[PDB]
Design a protein around this ligand. Structure first.
Ligand SMILES: *[B]([O])([O])[C][N]C(=O)[C]C1=[C][C]=[C]S1
Ligand SMILES: *[B]([O])([O])[C][N]C(=O)[C]C1=[C][C]=[C]S1
Lengths: 358, 358
């Protein structure tokens, strides 16, 4: 890798790893559209197993970007429309509060206050329907953005209904395979278990546990190499062979709502570039990222803006991830770690690196 | 051409020409992506000049499809956004009725009742400003569609302002040139006059008169070969090399509003395929097409649906044109005539032809 990239990555990431006590970490920098990889520490502390470019990390919420793109791909295929009511794809959801809540609202967290988490007690499909049927909105649809797994998680489950495929099979066949993400899984098979890193929470080795709509909201595991390819694919969608996937990636970066200097895409979040660092850094703190904020509809949505900082933070109990890229500069970065350390620390490191390279 | 296309075209067009007393006509059918041409009659009755594949016809309102795509291209380039207020590009438009009227409203005839025609007394740039400043909306923005040259015409003029280019130069550079429409003109050059058909109204030879916003709303002239190429480009935008143009074509086919079973795009109008023939035929009659109708917003707009009948009628005092295509079937038709004959007759003929071909 060029000396410029090695230098800024080393000086930025190693102190990060020490300050946050990160057991293992993998980083990819996409420079002029080419990937450069870096790895440090352990994937498994007890087994003294090193993090490699084949190590699988839990993406946590960065998984929502895959859900966003799969939904975009379903829209391009004519299977769904973001303007359609949620009830069109879930006829059993008859409760009166759902009138007016569309797939768009679900995908962008603007349904009116769906909760951050689907209660841990919701297991079966029966449980899930009862949960949504009993939910009462905090606000009217399309007025407030409240980041939620129960919102985009449902969008994902409904987005694939028309195809008749399971969420996992739709994702595998419509997204992971065309893009050749050969080491990306919602369910890690036995052959990859040896590469599945352990997450660490307060010293203990842990993996995300099953939960309702987990695959849809935070269930993807991937390597630093596949994630690099995922960034290249979102940086340059026209290079994608499959027509509906090309269009889906573009739709996932359209700006549907604005809150402050931030725009909500499908999974992805975007800001105009150049961006004010303190804004994305402080804005990533959960005290802000998880709070309700008023939204102004962008009518009609602005098509993917090349001069944008496009990003998504992600976390599970024992992992923390961050992805950011600027299409106009063919520049991007992926940071995967097996410890959920504070978001601001991730963005700060990412800004330092990408700002140095352009 | 295969005898099948030849037979359906001749069996449909021959009687049409006889019943409507059309002086000259050119038709192109795009079948499985290849064009087939047909011509009849005279481009100039007095000089006995026949209609040929090189004859230029006034497209009238089919010109709005070029304006829609040019606007879409400006959007893709990040020069304008459909959600921007009209005043962002025309600060001089300070009258309060303009608050809340966006470029989307202008492009889709939903600003609130802008008139079909710009008054003949309006010539000057200051005459135009005065006209829009004094105009009083009959309805709030985005509630009613009233087909209007003064609406999409203004959209076209404003869409090109950031580029710094004149509307004609932008059109030539960004649409005509990349697509190789080398015999399509906003102003017909002297070298091409020998191929410019005369329009006929009440037996008299006529050409379109200069008017405010004429280039933007109804001033393009073209040949049947160039129009078949235009249809091919709109049928398969993904084959277009120029990134923002491919995107612009797709944005022009997005569905922004719905009235009856018709959807409004940028210039183009669309219906779900299969269509009810009586619906597009009766719907083309000016008693419906030029009428004020409430519209339902498609929030967010549906990206170009492959299973659609996409079309546009067009007329000048002496010419009548029609273009229709079905992306999913790689099928299309262009009908150019030098007599403004009833819209329903055009659409009925087009339906018979395309339906017979699949
Ligand atoms: B996403 O933002 O990573 C989804 N976030 C959560 O589900 C909350 C967390 C739960 C455990 C770690 S972060
Ligand atoms: B377009 O629909 O051709 C614009 N129509 C007009 O400007 C009105 C006229 C229709 C025929 C001659 S002028």
């Amino acid at each position: 890798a060029p000396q410029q990239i090695n230098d800024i990555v080393h000086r930025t990431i190693t102190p990060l790893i020490e300050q946050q006590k990160i057991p293992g970490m993998a980083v990819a920098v996409i420079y002029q559209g080419k990937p450069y990889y870096f790895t440090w520490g352990y994937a498994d502390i007890a087994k003294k197993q090193p993090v490699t470019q084949q190590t699988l990390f839990e993406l946590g919420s960065v998984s929502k970007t895959f859900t966003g793109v799969l939904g975009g791909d379903a829209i391009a295929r004519g299977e769904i429309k973001l303007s359609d009511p949620t009830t069109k794809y879930w006829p059993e959801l008859t409760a009166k509060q759902w009138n007016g809540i569309t797939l768009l609202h679900l995908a962008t967290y603007t349904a009116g206050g769906l909760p951050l988490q689907v209660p841990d007690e919701v297991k079966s499909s029966s449980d899930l329907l009862r949960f949504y049927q009993n939910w009462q909105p905090a606000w009217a649809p399309g007025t407030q953005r409240l980041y939620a797994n129960s919102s985009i998680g449902l969008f994902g489950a409904l987005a694939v209904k028309p195809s008749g495929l399971s969420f996992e099979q739709a994702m595998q066949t419509r997204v992971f395979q065309p893009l050749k993400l050969n080491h990306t899984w919602i369910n890690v098979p036995p052959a990859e278990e040896k590469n599945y890193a352990w997450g660490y929470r307060e010293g203990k080795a842990v993996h995300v546990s099953p939960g309702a709509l987990d695959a849809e909201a935070y269930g993807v595991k991937s390597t630093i190499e596949d994630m690099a390819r995922w960034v290249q694919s979102n940086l340059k969608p026209l290079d994608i062979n499959e027509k509906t996937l090309q269009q889906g990636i573009q739709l996932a970066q359209s700006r549907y709502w604005q809150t402050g200097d931030m725009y909500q895409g499908l999974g992805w979040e975007m800001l105009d570039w150049p961006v004010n660092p303190d804004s994305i850094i402080n804005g990533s703190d959960n005290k802000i990222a998880l709070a309700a904020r008023p939204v102004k509809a962008i009518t009609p949505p602005t098509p993917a803006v090349r001069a944008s900082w496009v990003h998504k933070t992600g976390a599970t109990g024992g992992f923390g991830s961050y992805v950011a890229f600027i299409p106009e500069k063919e520049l991007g970065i992926v940071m995967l770690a097996n410890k959920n350390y504070p978001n601001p620390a991730r963005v700060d490191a990412a800004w330092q690196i990408l700002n140095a390279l352009a």
